[PDB]
Every structure is written in structure tokens, then in C-alpha cells.
Amino acid sequence: SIMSYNGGAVMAMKGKNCVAIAADRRFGIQAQMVTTDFQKIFPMGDRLYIGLAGLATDVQTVAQRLKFRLNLYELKEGRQIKPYTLMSMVANLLYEKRFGPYYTEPVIAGLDPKTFKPFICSLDLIGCPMVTDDFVVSGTCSEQMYGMCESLWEPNMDPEHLFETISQAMLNAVDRDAVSGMGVIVHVIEKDKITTRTLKARMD
Amino acid sequence: GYSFSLTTFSPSGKLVQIEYALAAVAGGAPSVGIKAANGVVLATEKKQKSILYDERSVHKVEPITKHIGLVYSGMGPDYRVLVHRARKLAQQYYLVYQEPIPTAQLVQRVASVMQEYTQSGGVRPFGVSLLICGWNEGRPYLFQSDPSGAYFAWKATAMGKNYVNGKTFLEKRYNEDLELEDAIHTAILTLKESFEGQMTEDNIEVGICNEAGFRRLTPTEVRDYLAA
Amino acid sequence: SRRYDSRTTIFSPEGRLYQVEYAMEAIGHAGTCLGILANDGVLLAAERRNIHKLLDEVFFSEKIYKLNEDMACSVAGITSDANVLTNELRLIAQRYLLQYQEPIPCEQLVTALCDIKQAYTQFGGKRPFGVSLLYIGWDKHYGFQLYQSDPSGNYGGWKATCIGNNSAAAVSMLKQDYKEGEMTLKSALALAVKVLNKTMLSAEKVEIATLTRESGKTVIRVLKQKEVEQLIKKHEEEE
Amino acid sequence: MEYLIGIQGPDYVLVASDRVAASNIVQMKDDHDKMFKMSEKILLLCVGEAGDTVQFAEYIQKNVQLYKMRNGYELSPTAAANFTRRNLADCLRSRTPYHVNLLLAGYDEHEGPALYYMDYLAALAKAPFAAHGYGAFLTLSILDRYYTPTISRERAVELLRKCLEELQKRFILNLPTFSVRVIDKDGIHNLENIAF
Amino acid sequence: SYDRAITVFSPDGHLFQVEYAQEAVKKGSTAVGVRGKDIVVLGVEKKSVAKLQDERTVRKICALDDNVCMAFAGLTADARIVINRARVECQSHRLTVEDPVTVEYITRYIASLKQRYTQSNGRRPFGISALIVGFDFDGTPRLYQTDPSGTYHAWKANAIGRGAKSVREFLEKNYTDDAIETDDLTIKLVIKALLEVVQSGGKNIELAVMRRDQPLKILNPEEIEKYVAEIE
Amino acid sequence: NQYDNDVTVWSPQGRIHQIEYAMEAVKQGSATVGLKSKTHAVLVALKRAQSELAAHQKKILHVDNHIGISIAGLTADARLLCNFMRQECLDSRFVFDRPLPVSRLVSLIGSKTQIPTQRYGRRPYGVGLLIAGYDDMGPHIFQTCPSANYFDCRAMSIGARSQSARTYLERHMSEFMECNLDELVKHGLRALRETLPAEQDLTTKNVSIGIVGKDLEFTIYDDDDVSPFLDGLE
Amino acid sequence: GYDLSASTFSPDGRVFQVEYAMKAVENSSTAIGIRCKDGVVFGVEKLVLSKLYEEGSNKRLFNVDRHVGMAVAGLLADARSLADIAREEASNFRSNFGYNIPLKHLADRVAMYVHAYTLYSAVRPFGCSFMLGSYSANDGAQLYMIDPSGVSYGYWGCAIGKARQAAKTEIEKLQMKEMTCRDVVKEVAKIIYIVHDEVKDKAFELELSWVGELTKGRHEIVPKDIREEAEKYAK
Amino acid sequence: GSSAGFDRHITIFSPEGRLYQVEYAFKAINQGGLTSVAVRGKDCAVIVTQKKVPDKLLDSSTVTHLFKITESIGCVMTGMTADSRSQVQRARYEAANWKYKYGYEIPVDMLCKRIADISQVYTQNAEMRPLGCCMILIGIDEEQGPQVYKCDPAGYYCGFKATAAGVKQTESTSFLEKKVKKWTFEQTVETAITCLSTVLSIDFKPSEIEVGVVTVENPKFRILTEAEIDAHLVAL
Amino acid sequence: DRGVNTFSPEGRLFQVEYAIEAIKLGSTAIGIQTSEGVCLAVEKRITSPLMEPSSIEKIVEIDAHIGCAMSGLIADAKTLIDKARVETQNHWFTYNETMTVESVTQAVSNLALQFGEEDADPGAMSRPFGVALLFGGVDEKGPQLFHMDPSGTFVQCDARAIGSASEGAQSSLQEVYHKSMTLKEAIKSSLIILKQVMEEKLNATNIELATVQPGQNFHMFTKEELEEVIK
């Protein structure tokens, strides 16, 4: 499969007044690991992040083209883009290559620039948006991520509690997947701070 | 078609064609735009003065979208092209961002189209000044795009015939904390300072803009506002 | 078709392009735009022409535009023409950043727009853009920079320069007031106020933007009403 | 299969590649150069399809040289690595896709040494050390076990020998000679060819 | 698209547009060029000597490649376009052919472009004159000069701009085989020719040099002040 | 004045000056005579040599095996139309495997030459043609011009001072049908002599001859082969 | 300078360039058309401007279709191009709808194509008028006339050219509605002879065409016998 | 007013801001010498027009200014003949295109707008001139009843109760004004015929004028015959 | 004002006529055809002494058997010269044989009237070439000398002179020319005539000379060769 060529997995979780986004760090061609610190999550604002799983080349291409459009958008109408508006912009960008699309399934996580209301969503390769009120996953180990997320997620979780839940979810999900792992990075977005930590994961 | 420009620079550094297009707007029917805290109001003189003409047939105040309305001064036929372009520009924006285009965004996109006709080959500049109003993020907006392509933000402005005397009177009655209802009376009062005969329910068109969106008032509504 | 053509892109008897020359006369009547480069920053000071009691504030700036993260510009002349050029500048910077994954150097951005203005005075049969620009920015090759282009596509780097209405009197007052190498942002701002007062001053009649560096990050910001007001009072004390 | 290898040290980046140009079952050349000089302190190592490598490598070279010509300064290792990834990614879904695997080595005055790994699908990855080809499977674990970030230039060359020696005893292909270069603050230096 | 013929013939067989483009070159800054034994000098007269102007961004002497450099006179905006085209052609010649371009090759290409703008629809001719100078693979100093019409010639010493007639005349009775004996007399020759036309000669004279197998060097304010004092 | 610069500008008299200005080129060229019989069609052009050392310019060109032409006016334009005529003739032989009827080819030229006279910027072909061919309807003589009008004639003459040649043809246009080859070629040479001034005469250096008949493919006679036909005139 | 382009209206609302193209049609020889009870008869007074021209050269009567005839007047070069255009419309029509194009539709199509050259300065208006005639078993006999501006009307008797105002009068006298093609041939031949100027113009040839029930709805030139039989009766 | 450059030759603004070329196209509408009148009733729309036919050689059955756009829409052209047919041809195409794309019949006001939009392009583009013709459309609306629209060469259009175009336009609107200031099918037809008659003072005969109508009970557009027109002409 | 394809009242295109007036300002070129070969000569017209005489090239080799001398606007000639070169190279590639002198001239004569504003793309000539050409080569018909001008009209001549002093040179060619001249005699007469219509003292670096014999290929006389012919 083309989507499992490089591997990878991204996750997004909704808390009380915060959101969390995590991803694996392994970059590799088929069964061979090249690096262990490949960026998958990209900042699209002060409190707006986007995770990208799938073909490594498309992950960088879509991430670079999204920044191009986002930059122009913010200059035109001097204001930070809203979480929901960024999802539409990405969908549009993905649906443009309807017949021969990018091989990446983005995950958006962030807070609104005026109300700080948690927002999480995930789109498919052709740009089909899907907003949820708990969590969204994307990657080769999506089945394992669902299992972990479904049984661990709790409504109204505080930043500390939210971080632990998304950490255990990703950690245990990537350990049951061969082409995913080599480290986990987590971004916990609050109202006045962004905490970024790397987890103690397996390296096999 | 021609590939050269019809609007060029003169010795003094002026674009005569654009300046001659502003003379067409100045001889047009008077238009009034007033921004009063909780909304915007657009009013225009619609005197057909011939009796056979069906008042309801055409309209001067047109909705560009659910929250944006439009008014003009100058050539009517040119205004129809801009209104159709503005409606297309708004729908295009909504197909990409899935959210109503901000009034400021639409005014820039429409002004860009008007600037294109002052530099392209084989075409003359539009002979119509626009007055766009809208409501986005709990805030009233009032803009004015002229034939040259330039646009400004206003609180209250007059257009068309006798606009110089319309602004002075508008500035002597405008108040910061003014409500829509009271703004609809000053907008009609400034329109009645050059209405020659008697202002009726189908003699002038009024458009209001608040948080519920843009809508064209009706004869019944105008009648009640005209009595007071 | 050959009788209505005004021939905008052709040479004249003395070897001069008339259309370009006429477009530079339009920039001489526009609002004054001045630029002063300091050691710790660069500023832009444009005189507001949109002055009216019924005029709303809405935008964050009327004459100053942010091109990208580390660059801002000031236009002069046909405002509608300036809207086409500023949008092209942002598209040029975004294109460079999508290709090299790094900010575009100040001179490369100005050169790309000057190549577009040069093309309108050579072929196409269209009138040129009647707008003069002033670029301020910071790059990793030459630090703080101040550029200035014109309708013909010509452009040059300056230490301090002024364009628009009464730009000749400002330039002459800038030469006898500028200190090559020993100019600070605070002292640069004072010089800008003394130049705008001479070629004219209220705080609503002017717009001031500064571009400085803070923690390996460019910061562009327009001085506030109060922020400028104080400056104007301090120049009155020396007068 | 061709072999590429790069090792980034504290303030230098060492690169090496095989010098064999083979057709069907015979080595037509034994002293072929797979390294392309992009600038004063930038080296591009390219391997892959017959005419694709040179065609792609020379296009990138011309543009990087053009950049300096009109700007005065040279493109940095990072900017050059992104420029070449963009170009390669634009041909991926195009009519004529370039099937080339490459390593970009360079030295920036402010960023220090840099080593970039780019596969044929145009995925750019920065690394302390990287390799390309079928011989990368037999030498990546050797680098893993002995590479340390503060490795000296003399130790880097010794480490490279071990990898090249592994190919002589384990690889089925015949790669006798290797081109060895090093990039630092002074520029690109031509080290003695390692032969067996 | 604009397809109107801009340059056409006149009653007495004259191309007015090309003659008007050459009139613009006479109003431009003076640029002299001298071809020495093992050195090539390019001097230009900085008309605008503003103290608030960044001198590095208004230079007239550019570089087309590692062995070819050039100066111009006339419309500055047109020169840039031409220089950028010549730069792209140099890299194209290094791609297809596996060697550097000769000075005449790029001069021929720049002249070819200029001529094309004098016989094309919807476009005026370039209003500049170039003084291409450089070295070939054998190490021979070349000095070519192109004009708006599209005709190029190889010279020994040439000046273009406002005071080109005077400089040329002065150069005619000053450029010998003994006047360019070394790498200092050639520089003193270029400065001498520029000094008899440039107002307040000294700080208004930028000049770069190019020696065999060597990049391009631009003498600064101090280096050029020593040559201006030496003369006296 | 204001109605003689473009071809798309009708004058107040219902004329197009530009089209008439292109007809002046045909009258400034060397005379050419084309006459036919019941089995043959010939053309006799008076090649003129401006310079004394220069060679007389060709006037008769080859189009096909059964079609030949004689130009008058603009040389470049004549080569432009000739190339088009050859193309059409080659098309017919390729598609229908047979010679393109002279009348059909003449109509094609009329269509192509008309387009330029109605469009802005374009100009009319400044060349007069004398087509001589032979198809299933016997020998033909067609005359085309810059106004895109073509006529089927028994005998024709165009070029400078060809009114005398034209007048001579009318007096003898009754014995051409029965006229034999040599007699038919003498009448054309005699008619061409009238255009020439009293001083000079028709030599073998200033006369070209194109002949096309039933079993005779379009042939041209230069200097040596022109003698046979020449020798015999008075 | 209001009459230099076709895309320019004059002060009194007139397109002079279109009126100048109709002035060229008035210099041409007179062509007349007459529709009888079962067909249309065409007659042009072809002016032979040279004795070297072959009898039949520069014919002003064409065959746009098997059932359609076309009589022209004005610029022959322009008229020939319009004849080609009419041949295409009729040919295209048959390929699309599967049957012969009605004369009214052919007139409409060509008239609209002629009207397109009277709007811009990029081209010039056609300088030639023409009549279209055809006969159908169900449609009957039709006769249309298109002028330089693009106006096309149906007629009973029509004339265009030099003496079209004098040839029209001599056409109203005849009762073509109750007449027949065979009898109309002579009538038309006589009309052309009366209006022909013999004091200003030179010599001319008589061009006669007809379509109707006698030719089985197919347009063709009037036979030599009939042509000469009507030529003697008109003399 | 004043003049500058080529304002009187092409569609470009003049010193006073007027389009002289468009003004000259309105003067070309009266070069046909005819006059059309349209009156709106309560259950119908009436279109009557001068039918001048001088020569008897010219077939009068082909000289009509009344054209059918669709099955429910009819119109009357006034001005340059050639321009009028061109415009009518476009209207038929615009109406057929609308039905194909949207699945329902084009409203009369929408067809008028579309035609007016096309006429406005000639006023902006300088390469081509405006048409010297006028159009008046009548028809029955699904939920509005009979309609009467008119669009001129300037690109401007409108809805009317009663309108007139041509040489006799001013007087026709002055007479219709009084008629609407103070209507059945018969009353409407008579009113339109009267207006045209009194304005020209010629006492129109059966084959001197053409009448086109549309009713609520019979939306299909049709042209009254000579006998039918004579039946309404002998009742006034 | 008028278009570039505007005919005059006489019947000549203005543009072409104006381009023929520009050919009477360039340096004089002389062509002579003999049985031993064709010889081409042309004055270099050196403006200043600082300019390199070799940089000026008025005589170019179209092919091995074809030479070409021009006059008028030299920059316009380069466009035509390249077309002639490619034309002969295409012929060789397609028919494995050399192209005749008449064929080459005709192919280059087809670009003469290929200009015009309207109804044309970006890569089209806006005006006609202001230059006259003199083609001299050797084919199956022996030595040949064709002459092409701005109107696209080409002819054949034994001795033709183009340029500012062509009128004067023509007379001298008619006086000193017969149909039995040798190649060496043609060269001598060429220099003599060229030496009378000049302003500068004709030396070995002031003029250009080239011959095309049936045996050897197109050859450009060297300084020594030119100096030994001036004796």
C-alpha cells in the first residue's frame, strides 16, 4: 500500500479547555528506518496545529503548500485563521487533486483565537472533513489507536490528565505496529502556553 | 478586441478617463450610507418620473449575500455587471472557506475588478461608485468603492448628485452612539435635502443591515418611516 | 485600432518614455512617504491623506503594508495601482518561501517587482503603474535595509529617503540631519517628525511603523495615537 | 547498484561514493564520479536511473550557480536541499519523473555542517549520517554502533573504512574504488581514493 | 496581445525607434573600457553621488559569469533585464557545452536579443549599450561593445554614455602599447579618460578590474584615491 | 486621403483605394501575353533586366503538368500564390489521383486572395497572374488580379504598356482557334512586340515561352529553345 | 471622421461605412428576380468589358444548392465569397437535420453572417447585394434579397444595381402571381433590355436562370433555345 | 458639451461623463421611421406596431416587426432592421439555453435582463459599436400575471405598464400616461391601437398594423390576423 | 500614419521602399562571377582606429560552396544568414547532397515580405529587413552570383555592386567586364573599383575579400594574400 510506505501515526484529543496532538517520530522506507526525528506536526498558528500521516513526500508537500496559502490568507485579512476555517482550506487543497491526490490524512487540533474552544478534526486523502468531540486518529495503526482512545478517553479532562491519556494511547498503539514508533512527541495546547514533550518509547 | 489601454497618464499625472468616470457618478442619483452602532442603512433616490415605469420591476439596493447589501450612484447598466461579479466573488469565497465572506474582503475583491478596467486594453472604466454595507463578527461595516478602484471606510457618506452638500449635513447630524432606527431617519432626512418633489414609499429605496443580515425594506416599512 | 492606440510603450525624440514620466508626476502630488534607517531598526512615516471626520478607521494601516514576516512597505501615487503591486509582492515572497523554505531577502523581493514594472514600459501596450514604493525589512545577508522603486522599474537602496508630495525638500533636510552609522531608532523617529513637520502636524495626519529585531524575530508595528502624540510634543520643545 | 555514504562531524561533513559505471554485466568504468559540485561548500551525490541522475543533477547545479550569479551570495545547504526537493517532487506526478536517490552535503558558516537524505519520492530528511543503495543495508548498522556526534575527522575516515571493508567481504557486487571528499569551513577537499 | 509594429522604416530609410533608443544612451552615465595585456578595466562615472544612497545597490559593473563581466549606459531598468538574460544564457552554455562561454559568444547573444526588439511587434527597443569585457580559455583579453540597434564590435578601448565622444577622442591619442604596459598603467588610463569628463573627478568614479584566471574586483574609495593622486 | 490607407475602409464613392493601389503594381510590371487555340495554350513573357549585367527575371513558373502561369507585379507575392497553387494541385493528385481542373484551381485562388481585402491590417496580393492550362475542357487562359476577380478569356495581356498588346490580340482573335502551334506562338510573340518600344526588339534574352497542349505537358523555353519559335517573325 | 469605421455611429445615428458599401452595389449591372406561379426567374445584364473575355466569364448567377439560385450585384470578389458561405450553410444544414434547407432559413443564416461584418472596425461590410430563389413542392416559390447591412425580405419582383429603380417599375406591371415561369422568361428578358444603358455602357450578355415545377425543383440556367427565343422577343 | 480625444467615435467617457456613441445609437432607432406600442392589462399584454409596406413587389407577409422568442414570450423590435434580427436571434438562444440548464421556462424579466447585459458590453468595449435597435417583451408570469419589459441600446432595461418606442415615442408615452392615470383584453387592445392611431393621425386599416398578444387564459403568444385586427378596428 | 502593409498610389509598399533606401547607406560590396569562380569584395568602413578590424564581418560563409556579402543594416543580416545556413544543412540531411546557389537565395527570399502587425503572433517580423545580399557559390552549373534585396526579389548577375556607391561602381563593372575573365582578373578589377568609391586609403585591413572556386571551398583571403594583391 502507498499509505503505509513510510508509516507513521498522528493523534488528537480534546480536553476541558485544551487540546493535545501527538505523533510518531520514525521516518523510514518500507522496513528500513532512516531517521528518528521526522516532523509530522506543523504549527499553523499560535494555538493551531496540524498533524500529517502518510507518504512522507506528500506530508512535506501538503504542509508546505498549506503554509503558503495560510500565509497569504493572514496577510490579506489581518487576522489569525479560525480552526474550522483551516479545515475547509485543507479540504479544498486536498479535493483539488481529486483524481491523483496527495497520500496524507491530516489531523487538525487547536483553540479558537477569540473563545479558545477546543477543536479537533480529521480529513481523508480527498479532503473529507470530520469534526468530533473526543479524539481523531490517522496512520498505519489507526485500529490500535481507536481501541486505546475509546477506552481511555474521558469527557472534561484537565491539561495534566489529558496529556497522560494521549501519551498512553499513542505509546501502546505504536508498540503493536511495526512501521510506527521510534519515539512520540506530544503537544498540549492551553490558553496561555504550549507544552511540548518527547516520550520515553521503545526503539525497536 | 483592442489590446492597448484607453486610460493613460496625462502630462500632469492624471488619468482623465477615471476622472471623467467620476463625473458620471456625480451626476447620478443621490445615495446615502449611514453606519449607526447596531447596523447600517443604505438609502437611494429612485425617481422614475414617468408613471408607466413599474417601480417594483428593477432595484437599486441589491443583496450581494446574506449579510452584505449594495447601493450605487452613476450608470445603472454598469452597476449590474459589478453586482453580478460581487455575487460571484462572494460565492467563490464561500466555496473555499465555507464561511460568509467578510465585508472588507468583498470590497477589496470588487475594487480589484474595477481597477482592472482602468488598465486593460479596449475598455473604459466603470461609471459607477459603490456603497457596500455588511455585518460580520458583531460589527457594522460601510465601504465606498469608486471608478478608479480605490475604496474607503466610512461612518456616513453621500453619493451622486449634490453629495458635497450631503456630507456637510450628514456630519452635522451624525452621532457615534446612534441606533439603526434613528439612523434610518437621518438617512432619509439627508435624501430629502435634494429630492425636489415629494418623497414617497416607491420613490426611494432603503436597505438596512444589522445582525440578522441584509434586507431591502418594503413599501409598507418605508411608508411608516416616512410618516415619522 | 491603430488610430485609437496612444502608444504608451514607445520612445520619444529625446529618448525618453513619456508615459513613465507622466506617471512620476502623479507620485509627486501624493502623500509624503519617508524612510529612515537606523542601527537597531528602520522606520516608515507616511502622511495620511484620508482625513475626514466621517472616515472610519477599520484597517490597521492605510499606507503601510506588511509584505511578509520581515518586510513592510509604503506606497505612493495611485492607491488602486498600489493594491495590485502589494498583492503581487506578497505572492512573490510566498513563492520564494515555498521553493527555498526560507524568508526572501529584501533586494530579491524588490527586484522581482521592479521587473514587472519594467515590463509595462516596454511591451503590452498598457499604461504603467503610477505608484512609487518604499521597502523596509531585515534579512540575514544585509540586516536592516531600506529600498525605493519607481514606475519605470528603477530602484535603489538608501539610508534615508522620501517619496511623494514634497520629497525634494525632505531629502535636503535629511542630508543635513542624518548621521551615517550613528543613528538610533529613538533618534531616527525624532528626525522623521522634524521632516514631516517641515514638508507639511497632528497625530491623525501621520502614520509611523518601525521594524526591529527581538529574540531572533522581526517585529513590525504601527505606532499608536498616544505613542506618536508624545513624539510630536517633544519636537515642539526643541522648536 | 551504486553506493553513497555521508558522515557529519562537529564542523565537517565527510562523503564517499563508488566509482563504478556498469552496463548489463560488465564494469564499463572504474573511475566514474558521482559527486556534483553545487557551490563552494555544497556537494550533491546522485545515484539512480541511467540518464536521470546526470540530467537532474546538472539542472539543479545550473540553477544554484545562477542563484549566486544574480544575487552575489550562495544558496545555503538547507535552502539548496529544499530547492532540490521541490524540483524532484514537482516531477513525481508529472510526465517525466526523475528516479534518483541522493545525498546533499554542505557547510554553512552559521549553521555548521549539514547532511541531507532524499529518496526517489522526494522526502527530505536531515541526518547525522546516511547511505544509499543496496550496500546501505550492510553498513548502516556499522555506523550506528560506532558513530558519535563529536567524532573527529581522522576517526570519521577510519569509520568509513570499516563500512567500505564490510562491502568487500559481504556485498555480492564488485565496488573496488571509492571517491572520498570532505566539506568544512575551508571548502571542499579531495581526499585520497580508498581502493582495495 | 499587443501586436502593433513599434519600429518601422522612415522616408529616408531610418528606424526612428532605434535612433531614439540611442539618444537615451547619450543621456546616461559614461562608461569606459580598456583592454590591457593581462588585465581588463571597466570604469563608470557615478552621476548621482548622494551620501544617503547605498552604493552597493546601484553599481553599473556586473558579472555575467566567472570570466565575463559588463558595464552599461542608458536605461538602468532595461540593462537589468538584459543582464539577467545574459546570465541565464551563460549557465545554459555551461550545461549543453562542457566549457565556459567565450566573450564574443555572449556578446553575440546579447546583440541578438537587442536586434530582436527592433523587429518585433508590440515592443520597443532596448535603450542601453553594453561594454562586455572578459577573458577566453586561452587567456586573451576581450572587449566588445553592443548598442541598441544590435550591432557589436570588438574594441581595444571604448567609452559609452554622455562623454563618450570626448573620452574616445582622448583615448585615441593615449591608448598605445606602452600605455598599457602593466596592470597599473591600464588603470591609470581608464581613470585619466574618466577624469576629463566626470564632474569633480575622484569620488565619482567606480571601477572594477579583471585579471586572467581571476574573479572580478571592484576598487574601493581608498584604492581609487591612490590612483587619482598618483596621476597628479 | 483618409480613405486610402486601409482595405477595410470604404470610400464615399463606393470604392476601396487600397485595392486599386495594388492594381497599380500589375501595370508597373513587365507585359505578358496569354492566348489559346483549340488544342494549345501559350504564354509569352518579356523578361526585363534592370541592370545591364543582371539576368532577366523569370516570369513563367511551373505549377503542375497541365498548368503554367505568368506573373506580373510583386515577385514575392507571385511566389506566395504559386506555392499555394502547387499545393492545391498536389492535393488533388494525392486524393483523387487526377489533375485539378484549371477552373477549380482559379476559384481557389479567388477565395484566398479575397480574405485579405476585407480584414484590418492585411493587404491585397499585389500580383497579376496569367494562368495557362489544359484539362478535360481543352486549353484555358485565366487572368487573376489584386482585387480577387478572375476572368476566363480567349487571349489576355497584362503588365506595363500592354494596351497595345491587348489591342493587337483583339484584331486577330478570330484565327486563333484554327491556329496551329507555331502560328499560335507567333501571334503571342507578335502581340508582345507591340508593348516593346520601337527601338529594341524581341531577342532570345528577353523572351520566355510557356506552352501546354493536349499531349504536351507544360514546357518552358529559355534562350536557346526560344530561337526556333522566334526565327520566322518579321 | 464618423464614416471611417463600421463600429462608429455618426451624430445623427448613422453607420456611414455600411452606406458606402451599398454605393458599390449601385455601380454594378442590374439584376432582377421574378417569382411566378411555379418558380423564380433570374436575369442579369452581364456587362462585357472586353472582347478578349470568354462568353460566360464573370457570371453573376450561382448555384448555392440544387434547389436554390443566387443572383448577385456589386463586388464580384465579395459576392463569390458570399456564395461559398451560402453553399456551406445549405450543406451543413443537410448533414445536421437530414433534409434540404428551406429558403427562408438560408436567407436568414446568410443575412446574419452579412450583418456581422457591419459591427466592428476589424473588418469591412460586404459591398454586394444578392437575391435567393428556390422552388419546393410544399414550400412553393420563394424570392429573398439581402443588402449590405444584412436586411433580407421576401419579394415577388426584385431588382438591384445601376437601374434597379427603373427596372422595378417595369416589374409591377406584370402579374407574376398568375403567370408561369416559361412566360416570365421573356418578360424578364425584355425588362433587362429596356433598362440597359446603351449610350453610357458598352455591350452586354444576357444571363438567365430559373427554378420551379418545370425543372423539377432544381435550379439551372435557362436553355440556349429558350434563352435565344426570349432574347429575340425582347429585342 | 465638450469633447476630448475620440469620445465621439468610441464608447469612452467624455468631459461631462457621457457616452456619445450610446447617444448616437438611440438616434439610430428613429432611422427606421416606425413606432411600436405596448400596453399591459389585467389578464393580458398587447403589442401593436406600424406595418409600413410601400412597394407591392415586396412580400408583406415577410415584413413583420413581431417575433416569437419562446412559446409564451413574444416581442416587437424597433430601429435598425439588421440589428433587430440579430438581437431576436440571441433572445431565442438565451431562452432555449435557460430552459435546458434550469429545467423551466425563462421569465420575461430575466430574458430582458440577459439581453440588457449583452448590450452593456458594447458600451464598455471600444472595438465594437452598440446595436441601434430596441426590444419590448411581453408574456404571462407564473405568479405575477402579464408582463411588459423594454431594454434599450445603453444596456438599461425596465418593467412597464405601457411603453412605446420609435419616432413617435414621446407623444405615445404622454397619451399612455393619461390612460393609466385615470383594463380588459378588448379594452387593452383598443387602448394600444388608439394610442398609435391618435399619435400618427392615420386611421389604421386591417393590413396597416400588426398586433401581438398574450392572455392569462391563453399564455401562448400569437399574432392577430387582419380580420381579427379589423374586428377591433371597427369598434372605435 | 499608416500600417506596414500599406500600398502607395503608384503600386509599391511604402515599408519596402523605405527599406531599400537604408541599403544605400551601408558600405559597398562587389560581386563578380567568372568561369573559374565567384569573387566577393566589400569595404569595412572602419569608424575609429581603436576598433578591431577583424570584428567587422561583412562576408560570411553560408556553406562550403556558398559565400555571402552583405550591405545596409548588418544586424538584420544575421537573422537571414542563419536561416540560409540551416536551410543548406537541412537539405544535406534530407537529400545527402549540397544545395544550389539559386535554391538557397530563393529560400532566404521568402522571408522578405513576411512581416505585418495584425493577424500575427509574437514571433513575427514587424518590419522588413533593411539589407541587400550577394550570394556567390559553386554548384552543378558552375560559379554563380545571385543578388537579393529587401523586397524579396532575387536575380542572377555577372557583376553586381551593392551599397552607397553601387551606382558608381556599377558603371565601372560594365566597362571592365567580359564573359571570359579569369578569377585573378576578377579580383584585381574588384579591388580597383572598390578603391575608387572609397574615402579611406584601401589597405589590407580596410577591406574584405573572398572567392569560391569550383575546386576548393569558400576561402577568405588573409592579410598577406590581400597585401600581395594590392601590389
PDB file of C-alpha atoms in Angstrom, chain A residues 100-158:
ATOM      1  CA  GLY A 100      -4.453  11.614  -8.229  1.00  0.00           C
ATOM      2  CA  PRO A 101      -4.398  13.124  -4.716  1.00  0.00           C
ATOM      3  CA  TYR A 102      -1.774  13.550  -2.026  1.00  0.00           C
ATOM      4  CA  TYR A 103      -1.345  10.488   0.162  1.00  0.00           C
ATOM      5  CA  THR A 104      -1.786  12.072   3.569  1.00  0.00           C
ATOM      6  CA  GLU A 105      -4.593  12.187   6.124  1.00  0.00           C
ATOM      7  CA  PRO A 106      -4.304  15.417   8.141  1.00  0.00           C
ATOM      8  CA  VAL A 107      -5.422  15.912  11.730  1.00  0.00           C
ATOM      9  CA  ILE A 108      -6.152  19.426  12.991  1.00  0.00           C
ATOM     10  CA  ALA A 109      -6.028  20.410  16.666  1.00  0.00           C
ATOM     11  CA  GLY A 110      -6.305  23.860  18.214  1.00  0.00           C
ATOM     12  CA  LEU A 111      -8.294  26.502  20.058  1.00  0.00           C
ATOM     13  CA  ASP A 112     -10.311  29.370  18.609  1.00  0.00           C
ATOM     14  CA  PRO A 113      -8.475  32.752  18.583  1.00  0.00           C
ATOM     15  CA  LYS A 114     -11.291  34.603  20.427  1.00  0.00           C
ATOM     16  CA  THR A 115     -13.050  31.999  22.596  1.00  0.00           C
ATOM     17  CA  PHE A 116     -10.386  29.281  22.993  1.00  0.00           C
ATOM     18  CA  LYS A 117     -12.878  26.475  22.407  1.00  0.00           C
ATOM     19  CA  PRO A 118     -11.137  23.147  21.676  1.00  0.00           C
ATOM     20  CA  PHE A 119     -11.393  21.979  18.081  1.00  0.00           C
ATOM     21  CA  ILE A 120     -10.280  18.697  16.540  1.00  0.00           C
ATOM     22  CA  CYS A 121     -10.912  17.133  13.149  1.00  0.00           C
ATOM     23  CA  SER A 122      -9.501  14.779  10.553  1.00  0.00           C
ATOM     24  CA  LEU A 123      -9.798  14.648   6.783  1.00  0.00           C
ATOM     25  CA  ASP A 124      -9.265  11.857   4.275  1.00  0.00           C
ATOM     26  CA  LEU A 125      -6.938  11.968   1.251  1.00  0.00           C
ATOM     27  CA  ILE A 126      -9.512  13.702  -0.964  1.00  0.00           C
ATOM     28  CA  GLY A 127     -10.443  16.224   1.723  1.00  0.00           C
ATOM     29  CA  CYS A 128     -13.463  14.890   3.605  1.00  0.00           C
ATOM     30  CA  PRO A 129     -13.655  16.801   6.929  1.00  0.00           C
ATOM     31  CA  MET A 130     -14.927  15.148  10.113  1.00  0.00           C
ATOM     32  CA  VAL A 131     -15.252  17.103  13.358  1.00  0.00           C
ATOM     33  CA  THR A 132     -15.528  15.120  16.602  1.00  0.00           C
ATOM     34  CA  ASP A 133     -15.804  15.978  20.298  1.00  0.00           C
ATOM     35  CA  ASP A 134     -13.301  13.484  21.701  1.00  0.00           C
ATOM     36  CA  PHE A 135     -10.386  12.334  19.558  1.00  0.00           C
ATOM     37  CA  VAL A 136      -9.232  11.726  15.991  1.00  0.00           C
ATOM     38  CA  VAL A 137      -6.523   9.392  14.728  1.00  0.00           C
ATOM     39  CA  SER A 138      -4.637   8.864  11.475  1.00  0.00           C
ATOM     40  CA  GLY A 139      -1.901   6.475  10.402  1.00  0.00           C
ATOM     41  CA  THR A 140      -0.964   2.834   9.920  1.00  0.00           C
ATOM     42  CA  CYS A 141      -2.012   1.877  13.446  1.00  0.00           C
ATOM     43  CA  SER A 142      -5.407   3.591  13.363  1.00  0.00           C
ATOM     44  CA  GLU A 143      -7.154   0.421  14.542  1.00  0.00           C
ATOM     45  CA  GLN A 144      -4.905   0.254  17.597  1.00  0.00           C
ATOM     46  CA  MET A 145      -5.348   3.956  18.266  1.00  0.00           C
ATOM     47  CA  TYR A 146      -9.137   3.653  18.226  1.00  0.00           C
ATOM     48  CA  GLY A 147      -9.039   0.827  20.749  1.00  0.00           C
ATOM     49  CA  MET A 148      -6.833   2.807  23.113  1.00  0.00           C
ATOM     50  CA  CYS A 149      -8.737   6.062  22.640  1.00  0.00           C
ATOM     51  CA  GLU A 150     -12.218   4.580  23.004  1.00  0.00           C
ATOM     52  CA  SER A 151     -11.479   3.027  26.402  1.00  0.00           C
ATOM     53  CA  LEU A 152      -9.228   5.717  27.882  1.00  0.00           C
ATOM     54  CA  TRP A 153     -10.815   8.996  26.805  1.00  0.00           C
ATOM     55  CA  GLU A 154     -12.897  10.813  29.417  1.00  0.00           C
ATOM     56  CA  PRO A 155     -15.010  13.963  29.000  1.00  0.00           C
ATOM     57  CA  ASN A 156     -13.785  17.245  30.526  1.00  0.00           C
ATOM     58  CA  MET A 157     -10.152  16.297  31.123  1.00  0.00           C
ATOM     59  CA  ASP A 158      -7.682  18.809  32.550  1.00  0.00           C
TER      60      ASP A 158
END
